[PDB]
Amino acid sequence: SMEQVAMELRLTELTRLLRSVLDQLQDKDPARIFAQPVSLKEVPDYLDHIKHPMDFATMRKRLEAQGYKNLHEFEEDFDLIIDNCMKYNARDTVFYRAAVRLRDQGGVVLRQARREVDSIG
Ligand code: NA
């Protein structure tokens, strides 16, 4: 149907805007602390601590399969990145501090993205 195509054009355009959002979020992590999944070879206990791991490469794979139907879904995954790190790592660590900074800086980007998704529909 024609509706299904228009819908698909909206998903596709949302994917366009989310890709740009992702790239901007990833730039607030120049250290690349959040680029890849936590290695279970190097942190073998990780899944005892963290039930839903997340990282920017895993978000990107989902994005490119058009797996985010709305901004809310995308923000859930970004929040997992931050929130997982702030639980596993102590407050005095470079990891914890990197998550705080990402969250703060990410906030601005996400604030405007929400306006764009509402505005453009
Ligand atoms: Na903790």
- Rounded to the nearest angstrom, the distance between the alpha carbon of 83 and the centre of ligand 1 is 10
Mark residue 115 as left, alpha or beta (left: phi above 0; alpha: psi -120 to 50; beta: remaining).
Answer: alpha
- At 41, the amino acid letter reads K
Measured from the Cβ of residue 21, the count of other Cβ atoms closer than 10 Å reads 24
- Rounded to the nearest angstrom, the distance between the alpha carbon of 64 and the centre of ligand 1 is 32
Please say whether the beta carbons of 18 and 74 come within 8 A.
yes
- The continuous run of DSSP H or E covering 59 comes out as helix 56-64
Nearest CA-CA partner of 85 in 59, 58, 61, 49: 49
Reported resolution, Å: 1.8
- Rounded to the nearest angstrom, the distance between the alpha carbon of 94 and the centre of ligand 1 is 13
Please say whether the beta carbons of 34 and 102 come within 8 A.
yes
- Rounded to the nearest angstrom, the distance between the alpha carbon of 98 and the centre of ligand 1 is 14
- Residues measured by CB to lie within 5 Å of ligand 1, the ion: 87
Domains and CATH numbers, the chain: 1-121 (1.20.920.10)
- Rounded to the nearest angstrom, the distance between the alpha carbon of 74 and the centre of ligand 1 is 24
